[PDB]
């Protein structure tokens, strides 16, 4: 599914990401925008053999298990295929575990390069939440 910006912001708010572990809501929207262009089905094969899945491009080497990745650790104890759904529930569940590590949102490289240090609340402005 291709979420609109406002649509995604209200869903992520309903899924409890506004102020989760010190991160304001716009961080999550901006991250989804640069990680997957708001596409729940996005996939990206990495040179190391892992794949990045879904709206938050969650990696198969550490977080979910797609059965094809070498040192898979499955930290979110979930099959990768559950992250490729139009329902964001499982993506948000795993993302909350990912950000609870001391690396916080720095695990998402597009967030790191395009969002950190920017006015991230701009991503939720002009939206009915």
């Amino acid at each position, epitope marked *: 599914k291709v979420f609109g910006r406002c649509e995604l912001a209200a869903a992520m708010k309903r899924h409890g990401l506004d102020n989760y572990r010190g991160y304001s809501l716009g961080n999550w929207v901006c991250a989804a925008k640069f990680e997957s262009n708001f596409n729940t089905q996005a996939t990206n094969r990495n040179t190391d053999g892992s794949t990045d899945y879904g709206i938050l491009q969650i990696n198969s080497r550490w977080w979910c298990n797609d059965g094809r990745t070498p040192g898979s650790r499955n*930290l979110c104890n979930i099959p990768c295929s559950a992250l490729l759904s139009s329902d964001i529930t499982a993506s948000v569940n795993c993302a909350k575990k990912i950000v609870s590590d001391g690396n916080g949102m720095n695990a998402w490289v597009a967030w790191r390069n395009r969002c950190k240090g920017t006015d991230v609340q701009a991503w939720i402005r002009g939206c009915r939440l």
Partner: antibody
Amino acid sequence: DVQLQESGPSLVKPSQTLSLTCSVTGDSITSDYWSWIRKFPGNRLEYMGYVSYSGSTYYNPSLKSRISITRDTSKNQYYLDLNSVTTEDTATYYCANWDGDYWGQGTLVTVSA
Amino acid sequence: DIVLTQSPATLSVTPGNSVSLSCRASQSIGNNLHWYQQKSHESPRLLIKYASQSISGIPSRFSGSGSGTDFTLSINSVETEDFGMYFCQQSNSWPYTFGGGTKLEIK
């Protein structure tokens, strides 16, 4: 499947260091985040801290920095050290994964001279 | 810290009746609230995650609802194995905290 088991002393004296070990069976400790929770005598639960996959640690500020959590990847165990205990540290300690699905059985530690 | 207040502190009930436990947060925590059961001489058991996400292996009579600051755990026709303590827990902010507990007791 995964099993967790607490061990260490059940009786300690005031001001010493309490060390507990959590033994994990069924999967590696590198595959999750791991925590320590304790229950006081009147059913009061306190989340103590957790160690995440990168080795970073989060500790409850109610413990004033007397706690250390560490893990041993070759033994498949992780640990709790609590310095300068007092009688207020008398409690049932449990180890558990972060998700909260696996818990150990609990070990009652009493602090007394 | 986020303070979590649970009510009633005690609930006496006859098996086959339905109950609702309440848990209120001092600050808005979204859906970041989990519910545990603790029976005598047993480690806590996770019943509900993220306010209403049901968990595999636990009776369907338990359901949770709520968001923000007000959350409820409901038990449709309580059974004798349900008697014990119920605690809510927020994971929105660090340090994680627990509510004071509801005791569920046979009438």
